[model samples]
Target: KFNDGNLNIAYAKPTTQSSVDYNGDPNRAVDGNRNGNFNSGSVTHTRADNPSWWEVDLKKMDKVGLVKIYNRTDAETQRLSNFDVILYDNNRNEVAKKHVNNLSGESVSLDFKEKGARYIKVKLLTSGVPLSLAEVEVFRE
Candidate 1:
């Protein structure tokens, strides 16, 4: 992050939250929950304002035993749900997927059981219906 003359660019680019906007973004990975007018203003163990997710491209095909996904949220927009994990192979194909309804701030892990995979794309389904994320991390074993 850098200071952009007038504003401090704490977050450089591609974030769940915007420098000006308070809620989610449509273009990026957003909350796909069909619930109407979703995305509450505050965060809780059941609601979230920003749902941030990240993806890692493993350079080559490898067998994965377990994959742990983590997310850290703020006090205001913390209650998160619909967390998902999708694996992409070396050929740009989806290998597997998993979803959890209650995020509860605890890290979620998916056990592929040494399933054949390479890339991991995590989708934080939504931060309370809106397309925003706080933090997303991945751990593979």
Candidate 2:
């Protein structure tokens, strides 16, 4: 398992992201493109709804330490706020969850404190607006 800073755990991994808008693709969040510039050219976008989520399988149980999400900056940055970072063990048991609200930057980091898990998920706890993400990065400790 790799634990390097900016570890690309989600890069090209099996993704279970929510459906995208007509203008975006769900795969962009885990495509290793850290570009937070604009529109369908750089990010993934989910349809506007409640409980929108994006998940990635790590293939094996690993000590996950951090989850960093890059948000869409071109417009409506507020929609990305108030989401949840969830961690699940090999058996899909919940390990940890952190609720994020009122974010003020382009990126938000949720630390898992060395929890071991084979799956990690990002779920939007808000409603009405579509969930947009430029990248989802994971790291092992």
Model number with the top TM-score: 2
| lDDT of every predicted structure (CA atoms) | 0.44, 0.79
Q: Give the residue spans of candidate 2 off by over 4 A.
A: 1-6
RMSD of each: 10.9, 2.3
Query: At residue 127, what lDDT does model 1 achieve?
Result: 51
Task: Kindly report which residue stretches of model 1 are placed more than 4 angstroms away from their true locations once superposed.
Answer: 1-53, 76-79, 127-140
Model 2 agreement with the true structure over 87-115: per-residue lDDT tens digits: 99889999988999867788888888989
What are the models' TM-scores? 0.51, 0.88
Model 2 TM-score, 2 decimals: 0.88
Q: lDDT for model 2, please.
A: 0.79
Give the alpha carbon lDDT tens digit for every residue of 26-123 in model 1. Answer: 21222222222224432112223355444544456777655544333433334345667677788878878888676554445567776666666555
Clash pairs, candidate 2, are none
Cα error of candidate 1 at position 14, Å: 15
